UniProtKB/Swiss-Prot annotation, chain A:
Membrane topology: Peripheral membrane protein
UniProt subunit comment: V-ATPase is a heteromultimeric enzyme made up of two complexes: the ATP-hydrolytic V1 complex and the proton translocation V0 complex. The V1 complex consists of three catalytic AB heterodimers that form a heterohexamer, three peripheral stalks each consisting of EG heterodimers, one central rotor including subunits D and F, and the regulatory subunits C and H. The proton translocation complex V0 consists of the proton transport subunit a, a ring of proteolipid subunits c9c'', rotary subunit d, subunits e and f, and the accessory subunits ATP6AP1/Ac45 and ATP6AP2/PRR.
GO cellular component: apical part of cell; ATPase complex; clathrin-coated vesicle membrane; extrinsic component of synaptic vesicle membrane; plasma membrane; proton-transporting V-type ATPase complex; proton-transporting V-type ATPase, V1 domain; vacuolar proton-transporting V-type ATPase, V1 domain
Role noted for this protein: Subunit of the V1 complex of vacuolar(H+)-ATPase (V-ATPase), a multisubunit enzyme composed of a peripheral complex (V1) that hydrolyzes ATP and a membrane integral complex (V0) that translocates protons. V-ATPase is responsible for acidifying and maintaining the pH of intracellular compartments and in some cell types, is targeted to the plasma membrane, where it is responsible for acidifying the extracellular environment. Subunit C is necessary for the assembly of the catalytic sector of the enzyme and is likely to have a specific function in its catalytic activity.
UniProt key word Transmembrane: no
Transmembrane segments annotated in the record for this chain: none
Main location (coarse class): membrane
Organism: Rattus norvegicus
Tissue: Expressed in brain (at protein level).
Encoding gene per record: Atp6v1c1
Name of the protein: V-type proton ATPase subunit C 1
From Swiss-Prot, chain C:
Parent sequence residues shown: 2 to 57 of 226
UniProt source species: Rattus norvegicus (Rat)
Residues recorded with modification Phosphotyrosine: Y55
Tissue: Expressed in brain (at protein level).
Signal peptide from the UniProt entry: none
Protein name: V-type proton ATPase subunit E 1
Function: Subunit of the V1 complex of vacuolar(H+)-ATPase (V-ATPase), a multisubunit enzyme composed of a peripheral complex (V1) that hydrolyzes ATP and a membrane integral complex (V0) that translocates protons. V-ATPase is responsible for acidifying and maintaining the pH of intracellular compartments and in some cell types, is targeted to the plasma membrane, where it is responsible for acidifying the extracellular environment.
Sites bearing N-acetylalanine, chain numbering: A1
Localization annotation: Apical cell membrane; Cytoplasmic vesicle, Secretory vesicle, Synaptic vesicle membrane; Cytoplasmic vesicle, Clathrin-coated vesicle membrane
Protein family: Belongs to the V-ATPase E subunit family.
Highest taxon above the source species: Eukaryota
Subunit structure: V-ATPase is a heteromultimeric enzyme made up of two complexes: the ATP-hydrolytic V1 complex and the proton translocation V0 complex. The V1 complex consists of three catalytic AB heterodimers that form a heterohexamer, three peripheral stalks each consisting of EG heterodimers, one central rotor including subunits D and F, and the regulatory subunits C and H. The proton translocation complex V0 consists of the proton transport subunit a, a ring of proteolipid subunits c9c'', rotary subunit d, subunits e and f, and the accessory subunits ATP6AP1/Ac45 and ATP6AP2/PRR.
């Protein structure tokens, strides 16, 4: 976008008979353009050219010329391998665009602050709910697995590294001998759910 | 930039003067046209009135 | 890479060109002023003349 490139001070505005064209000239033809552009059309104003901006591959220059010559300049510019943009400076449009950009940036940050504060709170609550609901799950499964009364020995285990073998061993021996062969992914001596955290 | 600007400002001034002056003249000629037409038809009216009165 | 004379002549041409266009438009404007003059006079004089004739 030219919004951050072009200034009001680069154009002759409300001119009676001139139009401004923008030409992107290859770096290799930069000096060439500075001279060549003069002969690309009839009725060109002397010493009106300048450089408006520069880039690493090409430069952006403006030219002011007779309205009717717009067609000829562009054609000859094409012939000399320059890319010429028809850009009519519009103070109101460029400002409007900059205001919209800044407004949306401000609104995004403003919502973000409270957004993430709200979400952080709601997600904690969601996590607690996850905990509550699975504690109930384990409650009712324990009831279904063992019957009544409801006093069960329920533990939250934080395994030690590489202890899962020993853990299985110890829990197996601990409960398997007390219940039955009837009860892994299906049959485990206890109620067991994985907490992924 | 200042040479092209002064030049186009001068060309604008002359062109604007040329067309504004012709527009003013058009307006003036139309008013003149109305006054002359009015004067003729008023003379015509007077003459027809005299004929009328003669006839009555 | 151009001399003062080469561009100076072209600037002179650009300005004179614009003045010439304004001049041609001014001439067109005066010709039309004459046309509108005659049109308005004819229309008005005949309309009023008709009203006079019907009156009498």
């Amino acid at each position: 976008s030219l919004a951050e490139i072009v200034k009001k001070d680069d154009f002759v505005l409300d001119s009676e008979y001139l139009v401004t064209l923008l030409v992107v000239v290859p770096k290799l033809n930069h000096n060439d353009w500075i001279k060549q552009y003069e002969t690309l059309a009839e009725m060109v104003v002397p010493r009106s050219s300048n450089v408006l901006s520069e880039d690493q591959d090409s430069y952006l220059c403006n030219v002011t010329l007779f309205k009717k010559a717009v067609d000829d300049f562009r054609h000859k510019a094409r012939e000399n391998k320059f890319i010429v943009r028809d850009f009519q400076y519009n103070e109101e449009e460029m400002r409007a665009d900059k205001e919209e950009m800044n407004r949306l940036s401000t609104d995004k940050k403003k919502q973000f602050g409270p957004l993430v504060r709200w979400l952080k709170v709601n997600f904690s609550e969601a996590f607690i709910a996850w905990i509550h609901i699975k504690a109930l799950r384990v409650f009712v499964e324990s009831v279904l697995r063992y019957g009544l009364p409801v006093n069960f020995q329920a533990m939250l285990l934080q395994p030690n590294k590489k202890s899962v073998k020993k853990l299985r061993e110890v829990l197996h021996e601990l409960y398997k001998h007390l219940d039955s062969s009837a009860a892994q992914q299906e049959y485990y001596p206890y109620v067991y759910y994985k907490i992924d955290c | 930039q200042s040479q092209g600007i002064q030049q186009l400002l001068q060309a604008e001034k002359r062109a604007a003067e040329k067309v504004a002056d012709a527009r003013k003249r058009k307006a003036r000629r139309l008013k003149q046209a109305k006054e002359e037409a009015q004067m003729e038809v008023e003379q015509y009216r007077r003459e027809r009135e005299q004929e009328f009165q003669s006839k009555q | 890479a151009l001399s003062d004379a080469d561009v100076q002549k072209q600037i002179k041409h650009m300005m004179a060109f614009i003045e010439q266009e304004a001049n041609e438009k001014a001439e067109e404007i005066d010709a039309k002023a004459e046309e509108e003059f005659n049109i308005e006079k004819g229309r008005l004089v005949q309309t009023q003349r008709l009203k006079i004739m019907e009156y009498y």
